[PDB]
UniProtKB/Swiss-Prot annotation:
Annotated TM spans: none
Modified residues annotated as Phosphotyrosine in this record: 48, 97
Described function: Electron carrier protein. The oxidized form of the cytochrome c heme group can accept an electron from the heme group of the cytochrome c1 subunit of cytochrome reductase. Cytochrome c then transfers this electron to the cytochrome oxidase complex, the final protein carrier in the mitochondrial electron-transport chain.
Modified residues (N6-succinyllysine): 55, 72
Organism: Equus caballus
Protein name: Cytochrome c
Keyword hit for Nucleus: no
Domain of life, source organism: Eukaryota
Length: 104
């Protein structure tokens, strides 16, 4: 698993829901910035979901592993549309890149 490969994975992955590079339009859910640093989905000019506005919790690596169970159980009311990826190895791989992306 390489960082370069991970970046590409996220791109088809879903990136449309997390908007592209800063400059376009706000995405449906926090891309990643402040994922393991900020509270939960409390971005700036970004339109947070009902859950984010409530200030859920900081999505961590380990917490994400368990959260992978019932996405609706963590943030009820939010639906996840799209996702050309599923392979547990693919998802986990992207997370590694995310670890450095937030720290590295
Ligand atoms: C569109 C229908 C989406 C797809 C496909 C993916 N995400 Fe998303 N995500 C989306 C929305 C509208 C929201 C808000 C609340 C929710 O839980 O859906 C989210 C939420 C997240 C967050 C929140 C992070 C934060 O800063 O609070 C993250 C980090 C997130 N979703 C990650 C993620 C990943 C890794 C995806 C592909 C592997 C993915 N989402 C798909 C919108 C959509």
């Amino acid at each position: 698993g390489d960082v370069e490969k991970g970046k590409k994975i996220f791109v088809q992955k879903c990136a449309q829901c997390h908007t592209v590079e800063k400059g376009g339009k706000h995405k449906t859910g926090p891309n990643l910035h402040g994922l393991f640093g900020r509270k939960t989905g409390q971005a700036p000019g970004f339109t947070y979901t009902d859950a984010n506005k409530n200030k859920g919790i900081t999505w961590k690596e380990e917490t994400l592993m368990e959260y992978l169970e019932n996405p609706k159980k963590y943030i009820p009311g939010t639906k996840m549309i799209f996702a050309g990826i599923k392979k547990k190895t693919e998802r986990e791989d992207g997370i590694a890149y995310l670890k450095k992306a937030t720290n590295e």
